[PDB]
């Protein structure tokens, strides 16, 4: 989708949140990105993809 502007610092945030326990604001943007870096290589679930 070439969204060179929907700076992803976005998705990671929500992600973590949805599994309460983690104090989001209280975790550096860093770890977060690295979190995306790993997510990216993950297969959607047929459902999702399809």
């Amino acid at each position: 989708l070439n969204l060179y502007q929907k700076k992803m610092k976005s998705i990671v945030e929500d992600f973590l949140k949805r599994l309460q326990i983690f104090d989001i604001s209280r975790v550096p943007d860093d770890q977060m990105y690295r979190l995306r870096d790993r997510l990216r290589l993950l297969p959607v679930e047929i459902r999702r993809l399809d």
Partner: protein, 50 residues
């Protein structure tokens, strides 16, 4: 020295109607892309960790 008209009468070569400018530059109209879109010799994109 005695005074001899003839020889003291000279003609005058002068240009006519200028307009001197300083500062210069100013005449330059210039804007800027939005920061999120930079590039170096690279041309791929400076600052590119979305």
């Amino acid at each position: 020295q005695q005074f001899d008209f003839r020889a003291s009468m000279h003609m005058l070569t002068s240009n006519l109607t200028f307009t001197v400018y300083s500062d210069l530059l100013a005449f330059v109209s210039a804007d800027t892309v939005e920061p999120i879109n930079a590039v170096a010799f690279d041309n791929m994109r400076i600052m590119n960790e979305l």
